[PDB]
Amino acid sequence: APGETKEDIARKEQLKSLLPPLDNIINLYDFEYLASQTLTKQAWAYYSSGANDEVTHRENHNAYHRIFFKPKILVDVRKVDISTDMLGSHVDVPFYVSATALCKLGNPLEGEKDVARGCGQGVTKVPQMISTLASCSPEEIIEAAPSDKQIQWYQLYVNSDRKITDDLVKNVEKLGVKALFVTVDAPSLGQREKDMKLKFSNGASRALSKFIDPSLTWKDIEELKKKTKLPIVIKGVQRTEDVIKAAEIGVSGVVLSNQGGRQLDFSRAPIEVLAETMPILEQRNLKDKLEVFVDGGVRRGTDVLKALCLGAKGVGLGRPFLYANSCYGRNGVEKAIEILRDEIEMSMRLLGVTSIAELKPDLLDLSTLKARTVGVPNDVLYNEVYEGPTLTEFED
Amino acid sequence: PKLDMNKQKISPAEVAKHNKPDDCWVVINGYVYDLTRFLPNHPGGQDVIKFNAGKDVTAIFEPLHAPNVIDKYIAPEKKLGPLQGSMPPELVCPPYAPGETKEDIARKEQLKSLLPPLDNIINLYDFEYLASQTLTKQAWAYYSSGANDEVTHRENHNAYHRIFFKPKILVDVRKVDISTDMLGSHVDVPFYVSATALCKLGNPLEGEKDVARGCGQGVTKVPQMISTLASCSPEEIIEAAPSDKQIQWYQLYVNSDRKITDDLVKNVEKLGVKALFVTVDAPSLGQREKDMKLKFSNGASRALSKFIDPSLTWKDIEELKKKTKLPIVIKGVQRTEDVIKAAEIGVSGVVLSNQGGRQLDFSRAPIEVLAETMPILEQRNLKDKLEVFVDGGVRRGTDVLKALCLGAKGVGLGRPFLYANSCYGRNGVEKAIEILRDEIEMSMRLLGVTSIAELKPDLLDLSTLKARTVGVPNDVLYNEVYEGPTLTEFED
Numbered sequence: 001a002p003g004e005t006k007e008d009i010a011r012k013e014q015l016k017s018l019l020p021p022l023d024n025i026i027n028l029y030d031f032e033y034l035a036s037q038t039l040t041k042q043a044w045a046y047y048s049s050g051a052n053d054e055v056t057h058r059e060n061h062n063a064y065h066r067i068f069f070k071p072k073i074l075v076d077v078r079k080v081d082i083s084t085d086m087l088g089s090h091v092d093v094p095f096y097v098s099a100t101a102l103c104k105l106g107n108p109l110e111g112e113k114d115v116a117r118g119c120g121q122g123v124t125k126v127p128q129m130i131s132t133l134a135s136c137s138p139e140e141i142i143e144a145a146p147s148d149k150q151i152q153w154y155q156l157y158v159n160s161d162r163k164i165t166d167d168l169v170k171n172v173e174k175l176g177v178k179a180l181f182v183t184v185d186a187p188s189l190g191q192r193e194k195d196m197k198l199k200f201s202n203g204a205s206r207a208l209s210k211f212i213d214p215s216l217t218w219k220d221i222e223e224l225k226k227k228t229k230l231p232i233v234i235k236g237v238q239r240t241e242d243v244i245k246a247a248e249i250g251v252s253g254v255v256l257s258n259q260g261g262r263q264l265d266f267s268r269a270p271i272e273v274l275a276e277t278m279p280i281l282e283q284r285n286l287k288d289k290l291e292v293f294v295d296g297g298v299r300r301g302t303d304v305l306k307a308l309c310l311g312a313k314g315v316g317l318g319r320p321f322l323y324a325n326s327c328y329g330r331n332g333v334e335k336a337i338e339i340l341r342d343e344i345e346m347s348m349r350l351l352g353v354t355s356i357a358e359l360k361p362d363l364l365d366l367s368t369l370k371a372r373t374v375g376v377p378n379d380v381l382y383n384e385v386y387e388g389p390t391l392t393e394f395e396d
Numbered sequence: 397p398k399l400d401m402n403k404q405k406i407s408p409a410e411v412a413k414h415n416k417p418d419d420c421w422v423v424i425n426g427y428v429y430d431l432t433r434f435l436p437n438h439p440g441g442q443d444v445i446k447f448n449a450g451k452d453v454t455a456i457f458e459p460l461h462a463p464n465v466i467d468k469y470i471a472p473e474k475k476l477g478p479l480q481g482s483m484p485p486e487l488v489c490p491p492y493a494p495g496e497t498k499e500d501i502a503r504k505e506q507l508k509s510l511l512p513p514l515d516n517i518i519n520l521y522d523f524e525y526l527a528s529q530t531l532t533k534q535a536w537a538y539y540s541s542g543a544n545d546e547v548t549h550r551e552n553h554n555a556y557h558r559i560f561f562k563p564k565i566l567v568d569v570r571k572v573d574i575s576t577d578m579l580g581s582h583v584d585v586p587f588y589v590s591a592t593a594l595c596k597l598g599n600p601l602e603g604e605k606d607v608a609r610g611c612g613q614g615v616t617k618v619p620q621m622i623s624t625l626a627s628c629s630p631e632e633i634i635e636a637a638p639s640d641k642q643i644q645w646y647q648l649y650v651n652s653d654r655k656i657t658d659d660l661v662k663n664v665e666k667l668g669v670k671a672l673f674v675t676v677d678a679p680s681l682g683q684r685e686k687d688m689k690l691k692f693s694n695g696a697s698r699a700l701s702k703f704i705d706p707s708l709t710w711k712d713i714e715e716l717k718k719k720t721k722l723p724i725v726i727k728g729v730q731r732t733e734d735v736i737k738a739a740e741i742g743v744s745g746v747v748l749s750n751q752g753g754r755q756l757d758f759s760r761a762p763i764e765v766l767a768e769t770m771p772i773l774e775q776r777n778l779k780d781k782l783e784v785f786v787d788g789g790v791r792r793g794t795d796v797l798k799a800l801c802l803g804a805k806g807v808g809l810g811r812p813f814l815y816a817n818s819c820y821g822r823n824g825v826e827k828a829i830e831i832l833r834d835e836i837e838m839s840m841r842l843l844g845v846t847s848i849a850e851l852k853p854d855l856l857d858l859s860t861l862k863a864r865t866v867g868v869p870n871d872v873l874y875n876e877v878y879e880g881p882t883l884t885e886f887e888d
């Protein structure tokens with residue numbers, strides 16, 4: 001606690017349903033606000049933070065905005081269809097809760113259970129990665145799913161102990177789960193400063209966690225494809241050339257990620273990555289060779305749509321659901337599933353197409369995609385004195 | 397210093413009569429000195445000694461200059477003779493508090509070990525924030541400011557942000573190696589301490605010495621380039637320095653009295669510093685507004701000083717080269733052609749620097765330069781003729797990294813070690829070091845590489861290097877009118 005000024009009772013009156021009626025809620029940002037000051041300093045830090053200066057973090061969201069829509073007109077759109085298949089499941093929606101370690105932190109009672117409950121409770125059901133570090137037992141989780149259609153997914157951090165892993169691997173292949181997400185981006189953890197900052201007060205490879213095997217490789221991989229039947233997605237790719245390495249070692253999926261930028265500041269945003277990639281995957285003919293996935297930044301229908309439009313087999317969010325959960329639990333979480341589904345939906349029509357398959361790039365103004373500028377330090381001295389036009393008054 | 401002479405005598409209200417900065421005598425410690433000559437030529441504005449002339453002064457001189465100061469820069473016969481008795485009070489100078497207010501107590505008692513534990517600091521920025529609350533309205537002023545509209549200084553840093561990474565994945569990075577080597581010696585870390593002047597302002601007490609300490613003492617250890625305008629002597633800073641395998645570099649401002657210089661050099665070469673970095677981007681003293689803005693709440697070329705000689709020229713560097721065994725580095729190059737010229741005279745390296753924005757506002761980011769330049773160095777088959785350095789504005793290891801992949805042999809920080817030393821002294825400095833090295837190692841890891849030679853342009857997303865932008869000066873009236881959307885509530 002101990003940033004926990006008995007103010008846990010500012011927090012308390014807030015949680016203490018100060019929260020609005022879970023349907024006054026309007027977008028994913030709404031969750032996130034309520035989250036930011038009801039959760040614990042400690043939880044909120046863990047969750048919110050990002051690598052160092054938190055550019056890549058923020059950059060991932062913004063890069064969506066170099067991208068604008070060319071939409072399509074007088075296209076009959078009474079009915080739109082928004083579903084698609086991932087790793088040959090077929091899939092309500094085309095986005096996916098994703099793997100968000102320690103939810104017991106903002107959901108003490110329920111944890112990532114409240115998540116699955118969430119992705120299955122509702123007319124809509126969506127996938128789920130299960131962090132290799134949940135607050136819960138894979139079993140404890142994998143069991144609170146209602147619909148037996150709800151799909152489910154293992155993200156896994158290899159180990160040091162090629163044993164413990166070779167165990168969980170099949171331990172989980174035992175319990176159901178339709179694939180493997182190996183999270184390569186995370187040999188060390190990143191220096192998530194908002195965390196450290198209260199984990200006290202309020203040659204140092206102390207920040208390589210040894211759950212993660214900092215020594216992972218393409219062998220260790222081309223291995224594990226053999227030690228299993230499940231498919232494999234390499235979560236955390238960060239360039240073109242690595243992508244091709246999955247393509248060649250012929251694995252299955254990829255996520256273009258950087259862990260919500262919690263990893264390395266000045267990593268690019270995945271949407272940039274996607275965008276340069278996909279088209280190369282035309283000219284090699286590894287075109288269908290590989291499902292590609294994208295994450296982080298994602299807060300709107302539009303975001304998602306854009307991703308798709310660009311190539312994504314499927315798009316992932318963490319935080320949003322992560323807040324969702326921690327304060328309406330599984331209900332919160334499914335409203336989320338609800339929310340984001342509608343944005344996908346209305347936009348789809350205003351966009352002029354009816355199947356996710358119909359989502360091709362030509363629907364995108366992609367001409368500014370690389371306008372990723374840094375302006376010059378505006379002029380302190382002159383702005384300070386300058387003074388602007390003013391609006392007419394009102395009387396007396 | 398001292399002198400004594402033997403002979404002369406003198407007086408507690410008749411040398412009170414030279415105050416006219418035309419005719420200038422003063423009394424320092426025991427002794428009396430004719431100024432009139434050196435006046436216009438004295439590093440920190442000339443000015444401050446018009447405004448104090450015909451006094452004692454020790455208040456003012458003592459705690460902020462180098463020792464052997466007199467007995468280096470003045471002739472044996474300005475060294476006039478003893479004061480007999482003293483002088484009366486105003487007519488012996490209280491030092492030296494431009495803008496200070498019995499508030500060096502909001503200050504004092506903030507320093508009031510009120511300052512966090514050194515293990516609390518997490519980046520370079522916090523030193524600077526601390527520093528900024530504790531240092532002296534001038535110590536802050538001076539350390540912190542840059543020329544003019546302060547634009548090259550922010551740009552030096554911001555420029556790093558138009559570079560992004562392309563990291564390598566699945567690479568065994570259990571062990572990584574940030575050491576590298578520089579200019580002949582081999583080094584622990586790929587970056588150094590640039591020279592800063594007067595640290596005794598922020599560390600009134602050991603100044604440049606605690607820096608030498610902070611980079612010698614720990615297990616990771618680092619190159620200190622020493623300023624020709626240190627608060628301490630070099631002798632001091634060099635027999636200050638705790639470690640043997642520690643390494644120290646001299647920065648030269650060449651005097652107009654090319655002798656004084658030639659002695660500086662031979663002497664430093666004897667305490668075996670290891671390189672000389674001749675700083676060339678200060679023929680005039682650039683103009684540091686916030687620092688001026690002090691005096692005034694209390695020429696045309698009052699910015700020259702026979703001290704920093706403003707007429708040094710490649711012939712001069714080429715003639716330096718023959719009087720010395722130390723490798724020469726030219727500090728403050730700002731574009732590709734003067735880099736090649738250095739190459740063509742075969743000096744042994746250059747620093748791309750613009751002194752951290754203090755000199756010429758609208759100098760470039762030395763990052764951007766280095767980018768444009770290095771490849772050029774290739775196409776002239778003049779690749780490794782030349783070690784390239786780079787400074788200004790570097791605040792996180794990713795920065796350092798970005799420069800290394802770019803070709804830099806090495807990178808310098810200035811203020812952060814200053815602010816660090818200032819608040820915290822030698823552990824301050826080391827602590828910084830440590831902070832930085834960790835960042836580097838850690839990101840060097842995330843990037844998918846294990847040693848410094850594997851940093852390379854193939855790791856960088858350069859595609860928006862050049863995107864320095866200026867946005868159209870935009871829309872007070874509309875912005876004023878637009879109400880943006882809004883997040884939901886909680887319920888009273």
Ligand code: HEM
Pocket residue numbers: 438439440441444445448453456457460461465466469492534538593594625626
């Ligand atoms: C007599 C031989 C002297 C020598 C060799 C000398 C040398 C120096 C040097 C290297 C500096 C650092 C300034 C910078 O940032 O550019 C300095 C600054 C300073 N000097 Fe001296 N100085 C001398 C005499 C004096 C005298 C007579 C005074 C009378 C007060 C004086 C007062 C100061 C002060 C107050 C500063 C710091 C102010 C600032 O630049 O913000 N010095 N001097």
Ligand SMILES: Cc1cc2nc3c(=O)[nH]c(=O)nc-3n(C[C@H](O)[C@H](O)[C@H](O)COP(=O)(O)O)c2cc1C
Pocket residue numbers: 046047048098099100101102131132133155183235257258259260261262295296297298316317318319320322
């Ligand atoms: C609080 C938190 C915990 C995370 N834990 C994991 C994890 O255990 N394993 C994993 O592969 N990704 C982890 N991630 C990364 C995500 O799966 C995902 O890449 C990310 O959140 C995408 O960005 P976004 O949150 O803004 O939507 C986590 C992210 C957050 C915010």
Ligand SMILES: Cc1cc2nc3c(=O)[nH]c(=O)nc-3n(C[C@H](O)[C@H](O)[C@H](O)COP(=O)(O)O)c2cc1C
Pocket residue numbers: 538539540590591592593594623624625626647675727749750751752753787788789790808809810811812
């Ligand atoms: C307070 C101060 C004093 C300086 N004095 C000198 C000096 O005497 N000689 C020199 O060559 N450079 C001097 N410099 C410039 C640097 O050595 C260096 O180029 C600069 O500090 C690099 O930028 P940074 O402070 O953003 O890291 C000084 C810089 C500062 C900030």
